[PDB]
Amino acid sequence: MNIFEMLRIDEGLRLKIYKDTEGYYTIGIGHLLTKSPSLNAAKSELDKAIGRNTNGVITKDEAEKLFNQDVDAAVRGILRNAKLKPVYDSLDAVRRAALINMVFQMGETGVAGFTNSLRMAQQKRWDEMAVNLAKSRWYNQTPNRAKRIITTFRTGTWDAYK
Numbered sequence: 001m002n003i004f005e006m007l008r009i010d011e012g013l014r015l016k017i018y019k020d021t022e023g024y025y026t027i028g029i030g031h032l033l034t035k036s037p038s039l040n041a042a043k044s045e046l047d048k049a050i051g052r053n054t055n056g057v058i059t060k061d062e063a064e065k066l067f068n069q070d071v072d073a074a075v076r077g078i079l080r081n082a083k084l085k086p087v088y089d090s091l092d093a094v095r096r097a098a099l100i101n102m103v104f105q106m107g108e109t110g111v112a113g114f115t116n117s118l119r120m121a122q123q124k125r126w127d128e129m130a131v132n133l134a135k136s137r138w139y140n141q142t143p144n145r146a147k148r149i150i151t152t153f154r155t156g157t158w159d160a161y162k
């Protein structure tokens with residue numbers, strides 16, 4: 001199992017513009033296009049992202065290319081973040097994947113916001129962190145996914161995804 005497979009499981013894959021769990025225009029493998037309620041604005045963004053006139057549809061290869069960029073960006077975003085870097089550096093390989101995932105879904109700013117869970121992660125207090133992560137809007141809005149990430153952090157294994 002790895003980060004790509006893991007996120008592909010959590011986000012799915014759609015070749016047409018769609019609305020996420022929060023109502024935002026998205027496409028491919030969890031690629032957020034815009035927060036604006038306008039479909040046109042979403043279409044413009046998509047064309048701009050792909051480099052062609054898409055008419056709201058992409059191909060699998062195109063989806064994957066956006067995905068690659070997105071993972072890379074997430075990783076890099078974590079590494080440049082003062083609050084995130086240290087955490088990431090302290091973790092093992094599976095848990096790092098859990099952190100990348102959260103960053104992918106919610107942005108660097110959002111995760112940097114889980115201050116208390118981050119501190120617990122650094123102290124390697126697994127069960128406490130899992131309780132703390134649960135007390136969040138994130139967990140209340142997308143509980144199944146959150147559960148998967150939580151287990152991952154708690155156990156340091158890919159059991160939730162097998």
Ligand SMILES: [Cl-]
Nearest residue numbers: 048049066069
């Ligand atoms: Cl982009």
Ligand SMILES: [Cl-]
Nearest residue numbers: 142143144145
């Ligand atoms: Cl969910």
